[PDB]
Every structure is written in structure tokens, then in C-alpha cells.
Design a protein around this ligand. Structure first.
Ligand SMILES: C[C@]12CC[C@@H]3c4ccc(O)cc4CC[C@H]3[C@@H]1CC[C@@H]2O
Ligand SMILES: C[C@]12CC[C@@H]3c4ccc(O)cc4CC[C@H]3[C@@H]1CC[C@@H]2O
Ligand SMILES: [Au+]
Ligand SMILES: [Au+]
Ligand SMILES: [Au+]
Ligand SMILES: [Au+]
Ligand SMILES: [Au+]
Ligand SMILES: [Au+]
Lengths: 239, 240
């Protein structure tokens, strides 16, 4: 049915599906600590996550898919999706990251966590690029839905007939979203050359976002290894 | 500053001529395959392809216009994506397999012949497979390799100084020039404007999955250099 939507419909749909911007259960009453910040960013994420599931369902063609496939799409893309959102919100705040309205960290405040400055710089850089290209919200939502539908497809066990028809559907929506991007740029008045040139710059960024994502994934799990679970503690209680 | 002049057709020839030699795995068909045997087999091939990649990068429009440190930064963020896209291209004609080199053609399984490297194989196989069904053209292919070179490392540039931002503009102009080139190749091949934009998007989104395989590869590679390294056993068999 999404395959029916005209460009203008594809835009409103997406725009309305946009999730609420959440607040960090952040408390200035207390100081920031390596682990303090991690759980802070972590809770914000586990909560945005919940809203992400509501959003994914609102995206054209998404629910046309199989439960399994939906879970595989959201399980390969969740962190890219958070990152692009974080990036979008951080545009108006040069040099900083608006994780949430009440949580605005600048570069440095990143060092308040082991090896997470690198991921901050990249995120700052990305937000900076979006700014310099004057990314529009209409453009933004197209890209978020692309990331959903596209980062998990090469990693589908395409061994059976339902899996491949599953993939075609995915690529048709993707083309439909590309049609939309082009329309938005046509409308904005760019020539056809600028059009294809801008579709390319936007898409090539999704690459750097996949990158940050993998970096993030690495840095996140290494945290879950460290400060994972004591023992000297439960034991002392018991004795 | 030459690059930005090149017409589409000139951009393709430049790139096609820049193409590195196809190398042979300097190995023995006699000897079988062990976790450590393979790794070194693929690793040498790679270190050798690496040396050739340097000659290639230097012949890519606008790459030498850049700063030495910016050049090392680009090849360092992308060398493995670059090898990956070439391996994938070469494997097109060999459904289900990976033509690392003419004399080294591993199929899926032969991958398990290395700890946790089946995953990366499948992804490579899947990628080669996608290129096959989209009927990727060599002209299309070389545009994509040069895009990976120029684009995979520009965000991770310390854009804190003036020459650094002018450094980045130049890189984005060549990139636009390469996009122009891709669209020209597709127009010429007769696709409609819709199919044109549509195909430029499918091609570029794959670069994303390549970035992925790259990071996974990077992880798997370094984990090998931690574990599989000093003979130990070998040094003992010897001495003993
Ligand atoms: C995954 C991390 C914690 C959660 C962070 C987050 C949390 C919420 C959000 O909206 C965006 C991001 C982007 C960066 C993420 C971080 C990158 C490193 C860290 O481990
Ligand atoms: C980097 C690895 C070794 C070298 C391999 C290679 C070696 C040569 C080449 O032309 C392409 C590739 C792609 C996959 C690479 C592998 C992925 C995992 C492994 O560690
Ligand atoms: Au994934
Ligand atoms: Au701190
Ligand atoms: Au696909
Ligand atoms: Au990199
Ligand atoms: Au084996
Ligand atoms: Au850039």
C-alpha cells in the first residue's frame, strides 16, 4: 500500500511517525561519573528504543514484513537509528550533542567516559556535515527509514522463496523512498545534477553512520564486560 | 585541479587505467589448509595487494592533490573496504565462491578453515551475489572503488583549520564528479531517469554494507594478531 503513496504522502507519513523527543532522567543534583554517564546515556537509549519500535511500525511497508524480518531489521539498525536522530538534534548546537533537551554534552564531557571521545568526535563531525548541507527534516526522515530497511538486508538468510520475495518488497520501498528524496530536492529547486549529487552525499553519509554504529557497538559491549557484576558483594552480605 | 576538469568519459578512462594488477597467491596446491595456514595465505596476498593499492590510489583523480597525512588517513580508513570490493567484483563469475586470486578460489566452507571467518565469507558471498544480479559493470565498479577511497575517511578528518575544510571541499567535488560519472554511465546504458537515481541509490547503499564487512573484518583480523602469532608449539617442536 506504501508502494501507492505519492512522494508527498510518503513525506507526511514519515513526518507523522516521528517519535517524541524524550528527556533524560538526568539529575544535576549529582555529579557526572564515568559509570554515571554510561547508565544515563544507556537508560535514555533503552527508552528511545521502546519508542523506536512504535516508529518502525509507522513506516511504509515495514509491517508488510514478517515479524522475524522486522526484528532482524531493528536488531541490525537500532544504534544507527539512534545515532542519526542524536545527530539531527545536535545540529542547532554546534560543538555539542543534544542527547535530550535536558542533556546537552559538549565534546570534552565525553572524556568523562573511557574511550568514548572518538565516538563523540565522529558524531560531532556528522552533525556538523548535516548542518553544512542544510539537511531538511523531510530529508532526515527519508534517511532514518532507509537505515531501517537497508542495514539488515544483506544479512538475511536468502535461502528460501519467502526470504527473497521478502527482500524485493524491501528494495521496492527503498526505491520508493529514493523517489521521495529526489522529489523533495526537485521541489526545493535543485537542477537534476545537484539532485543526483545530493542524493549521493546523503547516502554516502549513511555509510559513516554504519561505521559509528559498529564502533559504538564495540564500545558498548566492552562496557558491559567491565563493571558487569561484582561478587565480593553478594558474598559479604550472605556471610 | 585536473580532476574537476575531466569530462565523464575522461573520468572513466583515468579510473580504468589506474586499475592494479591481479596478483597470484604465491602458494602450494600440494599442501592442504589449516586455520593458521589459510590466514597467512590471505594475509600475504593482502599485504602485497596493499603495496599495489598505493600505486592505484595515486592515479585516482584528485587523490594526490591532497595532503600526505590526508592521503594516509584515507587509505587507512579504507584499505580493507577497497580489498573487499575488488574481491567481490572478481568473484562475480564464480557463484558461491570467492576468487581471492586466479590460483586461490575458496568456496564457502573452506572458510570455516579459519576460526569465526565463515560470517565474513557469507557477507562477501552475498555481496558478490548482489553485484551479480544488478549486473554491475566494470565502469560502474571503478567509480565505486574510488568513492570508497575518497569518502570513507572524510568525516574522521580534524576539520579544525582552514586548509582542512578546503581539503574536504576538494574531496567532495571529486566525489560529485564521480557521481556525475555514474549517472552518465547509466544514462548511456539507457535507463530512465528514475532507474538512474534508483540504481545510484542501490549502488551507494551497498557501500554501506561494505563498510560493515570492513569493520567486522578489522575485528577478526586483529583478534588473529593477538592469538594466532608466535609459533610457541612450533618453536618447541624445533628446539625439542
Ligand atoms: C552506545 C553508546 C551509549 C548510548 C549512546 C546514545 C544514546 C541515545 C541516543 O539517542 C543516541 C546515542 C548515540 C551514541 C551512543 C553511545 C556510543 C558509545 C556508547 O557505548
Ligand atoms: C582481513 C581478512 C584477511 C584478508 C582478506 C582479504 C585478502 C585479500 C583480498 O584481496 C581481499 C580480502 C577480503 C577479506 C579479508 C579477511 C576478512 C577477515 C580476515 O582477517
Ligand atoms: Au547487523
Ligand atoms: Au566526569
Ligand atoms: Au539487498
Ligand atoms: Au576508519
Ligand atoms: Au578447514
Ligand atoms: Au565530508
Amino acid at each position: 500500500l506504501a508502494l501507492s503513496l505519492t512522494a508527498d504522502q510518503m513525506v507526511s507519513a514519515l513526518l507523522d511517525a516521528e517519535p517524541p523527543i524524550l528527556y533524560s532522567e538526568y539529575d544535576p543534583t549529582r555529579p557526572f561519573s564515568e559509570a554515571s554517564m554510561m547508565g544515563l546515556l544507556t537508560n535514555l537509549a533503552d527508552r528511545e528504543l521502546v519508542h523506536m519500535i512504535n516508529w518502525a511500525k509507522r513506516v511504509p511497508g515495514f509491517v508488510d514484513l514478517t515479524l522475524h524480518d522486522q526484528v532482524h531489521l531493528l536488531e541490525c539498525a537500532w544504534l544507527e537509528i539512534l545515532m542519526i536522530g542524536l545527530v539531527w538534534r545536535s545540529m542547532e548546537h554546534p560543538g555539542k550533542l543534544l542527547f535530550a533537551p535536558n542533556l546537552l554534552l559538549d565534546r570534552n564531557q565525553g572524556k568523562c567516559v573511557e574511550g568514548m571521545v572518538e565516538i563523540f568526535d565522529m558524531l560531532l563531525a556528522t552533525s556538523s556535515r548535516f548542518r553544512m548541507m542544510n539537511l531538511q527534516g523531510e530529508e532526515f526522515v527519508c534517511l532514518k527509514s532507509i537505515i531501517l530497511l537497508n542495514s539488515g538486508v544483506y544479512t538475511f538468510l536468502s535461502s528460501t522463496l519467502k526470504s527473497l520475495e521478502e527482500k524485493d518488497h524491501i528494495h521496492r520501498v527503498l526505491d520508493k523512498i529514493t523517489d521521495t528524496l529526489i522529489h523533495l530536492m526537485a521541489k526545493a529547486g535543485l537542477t537534476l545534477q545537484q539532485q543526483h549529487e545530493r542524493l549521493a552525499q546523503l547516502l554516502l553519509i549513511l555509510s559513516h553512520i554504519r561505521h559509528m554504529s559498529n564502533k559504538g557497538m564495540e564500545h558498548l559491549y566492552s562496557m558491559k564486560c567491565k563493571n558487569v557484576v561484582p561478587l565480593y558483594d553478594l558474598l559479604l552480605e550472605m556471610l
